[PDB]
Write a protein that binds this ligand. Structure first.
Ligand SMILES: CC(=O)O[C@H]1C(=O)[C@@]2(C)[C@H]([C@H](OC(=O)c3ccccc3)[C@]3(O)C[C@H](OC(=O)[C@H](O)[C@@H](NC(=O)c4ccccc4)c4ccccc4)C(C)=C1C3(C)C)[C@]1(OC(C)=O)CO[C@@H]1C[C@@H]2O
Ligand SMILES: Nc1nc2c(ncn2[C@@H]2O[C@H](COP(=O)(O)OP(=O)(O)OP(=O)(O)O)[C@@H](O)[C@H]2O)c(=O)[nH]1
Ligand SMILES: Nc1ncnc2c1ncn2[C@@H]1O[C@H](COP(=O)(O)OP(=O)(O)NP(=O)(O)O)[C@@H](O)[C@H]1O
Ligand SMILES: Nc1nc2c(ncn2[C@@H]2O[C@H](COP(=O)(O)OP(=O)(O)O)[C@@H](O)[C@H]2O)c(=O)[nH]1
Ligand SMILES: [Mg+2]
Ligand SMILES: [Mg+2]
Lengths: 386, 432, 451, 289
């Protein structure tokens, strides 16, 4: 289960249009090309990704990737892969003001609804449609942030304290005392989602009027149950959906941060550098390994260096299917930063995950043994041996 | 100005701190009564690093004394420098942890931590520009380990910017004095690697070896061990207090010695050590200092550095000397011992020089090593930890105080992640 | 203020307490009359320590003791003895018959109507005390009031106080020597109470003390005075940590932490190394290595059991006098290098060490020699089960025919109590056998890399 | 910060930098490559002429010439002070050929981004060795070009001499300077780029050098400082560059930098910049055809 990688280029804003307004991103098929304005004579270096989105011209229909198109292309089959049972992850990436929140959250007041709202609509529509006497569904939700190496709850009411991070020996890292709440209607989870977005810490900077000062993870856990007393069991399947909105890398000179803003940017940069190190590794490791064929030596990826990578240990690697979405600023001024994103985005393609469904071995061992008995009995009786 | 707040926890920490304050007062010419009777003018140039000036031209150390047994406090007060400390900073309780980390961290220490933090806040707010904290204690003990970890976590929450140092005495392979040392050591190492910037590892076995072999002491006691640790403590902070041709702050050492955030465990050492009656034969010079510096037997952590590689080392010299000589000596040490330094950090040797040697020595120096071999200690502790956690040897005494097997399991897992991290840069062969 | 309360129950406990209080009075310089000429001569000090003695405004010092017994005679000796003025006038004597070597009589019939008065004074002392450290209960197995009344008192103390440490010093029946026919019944009956309620029980055997007196001390005809003095020296070494300064001081909570791996295996042996006469005091060095080696000798054990037949679960050494950690470390290493001393694989450390500066004192008219160094060792091992096994055997030989049972059942008990006590003792022996087993044979499943 | 703000405020005024470059081998910190490579933008955009001195070069000069077996920073600082005094003596004392800072900069920077000349001082000699040697003009002029006497660990014979400026102090006559320059041009080990037929600038000052009390330099009637723009310095920059890569592959010591507001990508940007300066020193060499 390789990590899917998608890239998306946004249109200009006030800052770039006031200054020089020349784009540098070209997009065609599954290829994205970035040119150097300072070295126009050099080769137009291009990178290949699975999915490429050109949101430059909204009203035009020439390869315009609306949010409906984006969701149908990435969130739809990610939601499907959740429906078999695999734990699924989405995570955003790029430099500041690139449009990570716009891709994930979007504007709740318009048809341009981000990934999270439309995944919510598809989930609720499907579970309402597919409800049956035996088939039944349960959905439970949570939403937390990492501000400055401190986990905070957003759906919870005002709690000045910081939640603790623990490590279950079998289930890996998790957050203790997280106000994880239930849902029975789309309107309820919309209300929880609005509350979480309001609770998020946001500050204004030169690069973005509403800049994310913290990382955030929206976490759904979805249980499918079989209410058949004859043969089936309850909680027969469980899946975990983890949608991650990361803060962008910042430069002090361009951002103009001072005091608390500068410290917040520094901490976000530390976390992003650690995550890049993990990505490079994850990618680099697979690389080395396959490149030849094998030889053991799994080395070690610094997951404890930051809380962000520690909490997302299972999502970056192991038991999960993960998708990266990268946001590009088309302006020439951001070129180097954009290149860096694309470079790390390329490495994100090389990561391989060991995805498993889950089931429940306590009962699936019994079911498998009974099925084996049935198969052997059928073979013996059909062949006249039994 | 850059001034340090000193904290002492547990019996071992209190003893080492008492000897350390004796050494510092002798260095700065502070009398036991608090008055100044020095000779050089540089002694009072930077007295405010470690002291606060009182009304009557006296100087009080900026120490905070912490324990859960009045006996140690009475021992410090009934001593040569008992009157130097401020009486209000003697924070203590009763019914000590009794070699139980859970009591020290959760049950008993949770009540005295508020008073200790109040005193810490009052002392820190009076500073002009605080630099950091340094805490002295033992990891294998009771109240010391638990309340030290608790105070470290609380202060790190309060003051994230300032540098944190710790002088930790840890268990040994042979020298064992309490039965539950692995449990306390494991939990202390978990809290330490979580929430510190520097941590100097001290060992009783190594100090005893230095006393028997180097110093030729027939009957060493805890006084000599505290003397050695105090010499190292003074050497680490010599540069803040006196001028030098090439200065070096604690922050500079932290930047130059910590390549990655979780690798902040250090092996200290000191030179010269002569044993008395052999000073006339030995010739004191920078080559001799360096040769004693990089000897395997001079380390205080009970690790053989030749069983690994040096990630990065730092030498701080004190006394008048030539920079060409010290630079050349460090270069020869790197070149001759080529197989004991990582090949991806060219010139992994920090050098600092100060012009004010100790009172009775023409030249002195201290050494701070960061090498992979330290992994052995952690590995050893882990083995012993397993040997008791498999059967739950003494576990109930902890679980009665509000603990669970999950906390122990994650502590052991974190130690395993640490030892794997260190082991990564041991094998040679790698890269362009 | 490390303050403990010493309770003495039964004749054995009372005589032990007499010897112990003689020793503490000699150690702290308090005269029999109760006054303290040392402070008057010097000017003042903390030698009138709160750990055993409480001071009043007149300069008098009273012990924190509670003597209890049903026979008037044993403590009527104390009231008319040398130390009449030392103790409080109250001495808690039932002017009635004795328990008559009957657990039921001492627990159910006559133990009542006195347990109240006793508990009330055990309070007037606790309330007077501040920062109470624990209780030290002295008694003897095989006795009526030494088995039943102690059981009732420990039950009520556990109900009332609960979390305070309750150390128990007791005398077990010997394998061969005995002074009563119904000792096995009482000793087996009280096993439930000393298992459930006591936090740590130190046990001694009279035959071992007689052997030590005969061989080491060259006393051909010892009496109870010498054994009581030895037990007093043991208790003094135990409690010396919380009275005097030392390089490494060990409180009672640390004893419980180190010597008790699990709740039900709190039965450590004890021993004293430099038991030696004045004539043999010469021609000997009495170095740290010598006393440390002597602590582990099978002959010097104070209970007739062989440590070589079992494995050591934990050890705790308390040194007194001119001792420096280099020699105790070297001695511990030397002991670890020996093959005969086997340690459980699941306790790699296996040693607790404490050092104190105050040397042991010599009782005038005694028999122990003055020494510069001493050590008291506590040793939690699996060999003790052997002794218990012997006792268990005796019980069956007396319970197969229900001999001497009509006396017990005539005071309140039934045969179900006997059966329950025997089953509980068997369960304890099974637990001791199980815990001494090695750790699972290396669970080397030999997993090849990833599953 | 200071160079940037000075460039914004004043701008037109000349800005001379005297800096201690990291040595090939010995140094007193493990993070020197990061700071040195990050300072490339400062030393290249805002500074009009940057001089670099290596500590090992001055150590070798002190050992060999002055016979000081155990030199310290005082001697290095005194030598640097003598260099700066030789540079600035024209603005103070009368002379036959006075060299102002403007004309000094004009004839030593052929192009804007190659303003990194080496420096050397000829009459570095002890009191004992001051005797037995004439110390004539030709001797000092030849001694300037020796690789042994250079103040940076870089061999001039591995590159080409782009430009040179000789500033004499003391009893010096133009005839001897012309003869020495002709003799140097006759020598073939010293290679000059074809597009600079003149090559040499000459300045003379009457004031002889002074001797600090308690110093090591002997009293000499004559002295000269040679300041030469050459392509060999690129090698001195490449060695350090290698170190940076060996420290940047694994992102060692990066968390300290990025925890103080700096972005990760600035390292790579500085690396590409320094890569450029190197290529340019390579391009400017290739002779014309
Ligand atoms: C012949 C001579 O010169 O006397 C020396 C001496 O003999 C030797 C052996 C000294 C001596 O040290 C010891 O014997 C010793 C014993 C146990 C542990 C440590 C030391 C000396 O005691 C130690 C003492 O050291 C100092 O005064 C330092 O300044 C030292 N001071 C203290 O530790 C100190 C002592 C009492 C009160 C307060 C401070 C110091 C070192 C580093 C940083 C600060 C202070 C000196 C000069 C000597 C004697 C007296 C014999 C040595 O000590 C030091 C570190 O100076 C041990 O090896 C060194 C080298 C010396 O040659
Ligand atoms: N070491 C020692 N043991 C004693 C002493 N006195 C009695 N014992 C032991 O006590 C046991 C008999 O039970 P006791 O506890 O004395 O009986 P008691 O205390 O008089 O109580 P009752 O039997 O009800 O009268 C014997 O086996 C003795 O070994 C003594 O002074 N020293
Ligand atoms: N295709 C687009 N069309 C219109 N507006 C867009 C588009 N992409 C982004 N924006 C706007 O650009 C702004 C910045 O987007 P946003 O997603 O909030 O930045 P970000 O990803 O959160 N970076 P950060 O500052 O770290 O939070 C928002 O006001 C978006 O509405
Ligand atoms: N170097 C040194 N170590 C000591 C001293 N006192 C105790 N220790 C060590 O501390 C450990 C016991 O921890 P302890 O101080 O009792 O823990 P605490 O009760 O919580 O303070 C032992 O392993 C000793 O080796 C001392 O004076 N010097
Ligand atoms: Mg955002
Ligand atoms: Mg009796």
């Amino acid at each position: 289960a390789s990590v899917k990688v998608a890239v998306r280029v946004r249109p200009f804003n006030s800052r770039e249009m006031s200054r020089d307004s020349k784009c540098i991103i070209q997009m065609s098929g599954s290829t994205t090309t970035i040119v150097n304005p300072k070295q126009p004579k050099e080769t137009p270096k291009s990178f290949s990704f699975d999915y490429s989105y050109w949101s430059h011209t909204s009203p035009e229909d020439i390869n315009y990737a609306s949010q409906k198109q984006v969701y149908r292309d990435i969130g739809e089959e990610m939601l499907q892969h959740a429906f078999e049972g695999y734990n699924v992850c989405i995570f955003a990436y790029g430099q500041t003001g690139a449009g990570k929140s716009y891709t994930m959250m979007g504007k709740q007041e318009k048809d341009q609804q981000g990934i999270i709202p439309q995944l919510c609509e598809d989930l609720f529509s499907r579970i309402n449609d597919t409800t049956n006497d035996n088939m039944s569904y349960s959905v439970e939700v949570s939403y937390m942030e990492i501000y400055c190496e401190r986990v905070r709850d957003l759906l919870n009411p005002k709690n000045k304290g910081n939640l603790r991070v623990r490590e279950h020996p079998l289930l890996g890292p998790y957050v203790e005392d997280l106000s994880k709440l239930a849902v029975t209607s789309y309107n309820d989870i919309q209300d929880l989602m609005d509350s979480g977005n309001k609770a998020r810490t946001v500050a204004a900077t030169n690069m973005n009027e509403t800049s994310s000062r913290s990382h955030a993870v929206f976490n759904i856990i979805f249980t499918q149950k079989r209410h058949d007393a004859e043969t089936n069991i309850t909680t027969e399947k469980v899946s975990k959906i983890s949608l991650v909105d990361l803060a962008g890398s910042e430069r002090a000179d361009s951002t103009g941060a001072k005091g608390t803003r500068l410290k917040e940017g520094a901490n976000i940069n530390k976390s992003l550098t650690t995550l890049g190190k993990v990505i490079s590794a994850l990618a680099e490791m697979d690389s080395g390994p396959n490149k030849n064929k094998k030889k053991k030596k799994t080395d070690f990826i610094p997951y404890r260096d930051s809380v962000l990578t520690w909490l997302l240990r299972e999502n970056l690697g192991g038991n999960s299917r993960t998708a990266m979405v990268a946001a590009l600023s088309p302006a020439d001024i951001n070129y180097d930063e954009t290149l860096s994103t694309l470079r790390y985005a390329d490495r994100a393609k090389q990561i391989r995950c060991n995805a498993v469904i889950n089931e429940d071995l306590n009962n699936k061992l019994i079911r498998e043994l009974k099925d084996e008995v049935t198969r052997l009995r059928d073979l013996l009786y059909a062949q006249g041996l039994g | 100005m850059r001034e340090i707040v000193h904290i002492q926890a547990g019996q071992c920490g209190n003893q080492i701190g008492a000897k350390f304050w004796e050494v510092i007062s002798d260095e700065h010419g502070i009398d036991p009564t608090g008055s100044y009777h020095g000779d050089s003018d540089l002694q009072l140039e930077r007295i405010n690093v470690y002291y606060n000036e009182a009304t009557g031209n006296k100087y009080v150390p900026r120490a905070i004394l912490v324990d859960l047994e009045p006996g140690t406090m009475d021992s410090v007060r009934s001593g040569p420098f008992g009157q130097i400390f401020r009486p209000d900073n003697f924070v203590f309780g009763q019914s000590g942890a009794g070699n139980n980390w859970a009591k020290g961290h959760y049950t008993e220490g949770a009540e005295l931590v508020d008073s200790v933090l109040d005193v810490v806040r009052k002392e820190s707010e009076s500073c002009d520009c605080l630099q950091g904290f340094q805490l002295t204690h033992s990891l294998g003990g009771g109240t010391g380990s638990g309340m030290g970890t608790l105070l470290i976590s609380k202060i790190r929450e309060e003051y994230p910017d300032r540098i944190m140092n710790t002088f930790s005495v840890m268990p040994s392979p042979k020298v064992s004095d309490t039965v539950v040392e692995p449990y306390n050591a494991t939990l202390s190492v978990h809290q330490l690697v979580e929430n510190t910037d520097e941590t100097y590892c001290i060992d009783n076995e190594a100090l005893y070896d230095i006393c028997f072999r180097t110093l030729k002491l027939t009957t060493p006691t805890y006084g000599d061990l505290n003397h050695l640790v105090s010499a190292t403590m003074s050497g680490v902070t010599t540069c803040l207090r006196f001028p030098g041709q090439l200065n070096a702050d604690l922050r500079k050492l932290a930047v130059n010695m910590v390549p990655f955030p979780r690798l902040h465990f250090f092996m200290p050492g000191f030179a010269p050590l002569t044993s008395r009656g052999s000073q006339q034969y030995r010739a004191l010079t920078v080559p001799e200092l360096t040769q004693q510096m990089f000897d395997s037997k001079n380390m205080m952590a009970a690790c053989d550095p030749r069983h690994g590689r040096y990630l990065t080392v730092a030498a701080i010299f004190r006394g008048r000397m030539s920079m060409k000589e010290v630079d050349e000596q460090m270069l020869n040490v790197q070149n001759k011992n080529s197989s004991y330094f990582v090949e991806w950090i060219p010139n992994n040797v920090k050098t600092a020089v100060c012009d004010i040697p100790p009172r009775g020595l023409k030249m002195s120096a201290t050494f701070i090593g960061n090498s992979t071999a330290i992994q052995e200690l952690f590995k050893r502790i882990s083995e012993q930890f397993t040997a008791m956690f498999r059967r739950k040897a003494f576990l109930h005494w902890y679980t009665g105080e509000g603990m669970d097997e999950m906390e122990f399991t994650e502590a052991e897992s974190n130690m395993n992640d640490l030892v794997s991290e260190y082991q990564q840069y041991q094998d040679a062969t790698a890269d362009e | 203020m490390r303050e403990c309360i010493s309770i003495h129950v039964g004749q054995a406990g009372v005589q032990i307490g007499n010897a112990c209080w003689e020793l503490y009075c000699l150690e702290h310089g308090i005269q029999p009359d109760g006054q303290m000429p040392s402070d008057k001569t010097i000017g003042g000090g903390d030698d009138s320590f709160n750990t055993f003695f409480s001071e009043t405004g007149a300069g008098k010092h009273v012990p924190r003791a509670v003597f209890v017994d049903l026979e008037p005679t044993v403590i009527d000796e104390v009231r008319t003895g040398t130390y009449r003025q030392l103790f409080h006038p109250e001495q808690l004597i039932t002017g009635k018959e004795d328990a008559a070597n009957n657990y039921a009589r001492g627990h159910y019939t006559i133990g009542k109507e006195i347990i109240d008065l006793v508990l009330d004074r055990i309070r007037k002392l606790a309330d007077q005390c501040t920062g109470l450290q624990g209780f030290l209960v002295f008694h003897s197995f095989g006795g009526g009031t030494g088995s039943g009344f102690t059981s009732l008192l420990m039950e009520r103390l556990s109900v009332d106080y609960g979390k305070k440490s309750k150390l128990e010093f007791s005398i077990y029946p010997a394998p061969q020597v005995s002074t009563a026919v119904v000792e096995p019944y009482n000793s087996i009956l009280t096993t439930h109470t000393t298992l459930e309620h006591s936090d740590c029980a130190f046990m001694v055997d009279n035959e071992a003390i007689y052997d030590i007196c005969r061989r080491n001390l060259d006393i051909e005809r010892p009496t109870y005075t010498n054994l009581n003095r030895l037990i007093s020296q043991i208790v003094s070494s135990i409690t010396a940590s919380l009275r005097f300064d030392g390089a490494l001081n060990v409180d009672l909570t640390e004893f419980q932490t180190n010597l008790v791996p699990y709740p039900r295996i709190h039965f450590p042996l004890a021993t004293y190394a430099p038991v030696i006469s004045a004539e043999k005091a010469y021609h000997e060095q009495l170095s740290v290595a010598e006393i440390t080696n002597a602590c582990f000798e099978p002959a010097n054990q104070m209970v007739k059991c062989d440590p070589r037949h079992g494995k050591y679960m934990a050890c705790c050494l308390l040194y007194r006098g001119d001792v420096v950690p280099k020699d105790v470390n070297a001695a511990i290493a030397t002991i670890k290098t020996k093959r005969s001393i086997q340690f459980v694989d699941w306790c790699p450390t296996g040693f607790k060490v404490g050092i104190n500066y105050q040397p042991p004192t010599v009782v005038p008219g005694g028999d122990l020699a003055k020494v510069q160094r001493a050590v008291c060792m506590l040793s939690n091992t699996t060999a003790i089960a052997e002794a218990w096994a012997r006792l268990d055997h005796k019980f069956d030989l007396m319970y197969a025919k229900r001999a001497f049972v009509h006396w017990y059942v005539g005071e309140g008990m039934e045969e179900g109590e006997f059966s329950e006590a025997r089953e509980d003792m068997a369960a304890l022996e099974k637990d001791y056998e199980e815990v001494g087993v090695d750790s699972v044979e290396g669970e080397g499943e030999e997993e090849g890399e990833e599953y």
